Amino acid sequence: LTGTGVLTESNKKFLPFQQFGRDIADTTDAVRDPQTLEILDITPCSFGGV
Amino acid sequence: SALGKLQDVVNQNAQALNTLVKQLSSNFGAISSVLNDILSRLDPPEAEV
Amino acid sequence: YFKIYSKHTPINLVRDLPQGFSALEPLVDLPIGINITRFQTLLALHRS
Amino acid sequence: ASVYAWNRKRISNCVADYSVLYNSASFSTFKCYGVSPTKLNDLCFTNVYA
Numbered sequence A: 001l002t003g004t005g006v007l008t009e010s011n012k013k014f015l016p017f018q019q020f021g022r023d024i025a026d027t028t029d030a031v032r033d034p035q036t037l038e039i040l041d042i043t044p045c046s047f048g049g050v
Numbered sequence B: 001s002a003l004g005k006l007q008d009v010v011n012q013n014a015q016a017l018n019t020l021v022k023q024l025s026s027n028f029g030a031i032s033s034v035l036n037d038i039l040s041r042l043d044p045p046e047a048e049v
Numbered sequence C: 001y002f003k004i005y006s007k008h009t010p011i012n013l014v015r016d017l018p019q020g021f022s023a024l025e026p027l028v029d030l031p032i033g034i035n036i037t038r039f040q041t042l043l044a045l046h047r048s
Numbered sequence D: 001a002s003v004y005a006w007n008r009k010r011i012s013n014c015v016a017d018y019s020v021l022y023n024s025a026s027f028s029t030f031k032c033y034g035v036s037p038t039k040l041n042d043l044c045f046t047n048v049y050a
């Protein structure tokens, strides 16, 4: 799964089966990292109009 | 339902935006709706299609 | 893939199914790759 | 096996080096459809069947 974003701590109580999370666009918004099983939130990097 | 006229405008704008974001999840006949999957899975001659 | 979804609920109804809502969490995602068209459950006898 | 009774083997829980398949000249036909041959070392899979 490829993508760009800032990986931050999260407070989403994922259930054991649950691995990732999806937004309305179906783009991944949270992910469970392998090897360490922690849940990292994925927030798109800051952008806007110059 | 006193302020329905403003609420209809807000709901229509939010619904149009929501449908616009829902359109990203459709592949439109391609193998996948994600660009990153196509860039990671295929060579440029089929990736351009 | 043979998916087993399971849920355990504490109930106190005597005869029929209880009326309520309980979502079944996925328990086992099983990699078998075989054809299944017929099934049979297993019970346990009591001997005295 | 013969083609009417073609043998299906499951491949799971392994790290696979496909670069020895691309760089080998012993195969007369090495043709991939849903995936690029050179990207196979960069992706993760499940339900692999031979």
Ligand SMILES: *[C@@H]1O[C@H](CO)[C@@H](O)[C@H](O)[C@H]1NC(C)=O
Pocket (backbone or CB within 6 Å): A034, A035, A036
């Ligand atoms: C390796 O990954 C597994 C699950 O994928 C995990 O249980 C284990 O703790 C990991 N080991 C290390 C050393 O990170």
Ligand SMILES: *[C@@H]1O[C@H](CO)[C@@H](O)[C@H](O)[C@H]1NC(C)=O
Pocket (backbone or CB within 6 Å): C035, C036, C037
């Ligand atoms: C499974 O077996 C039934 C007959 O019991 C057959 O009709 C069906 O085509 C088989 N399916 C597969 C996927 O082998």
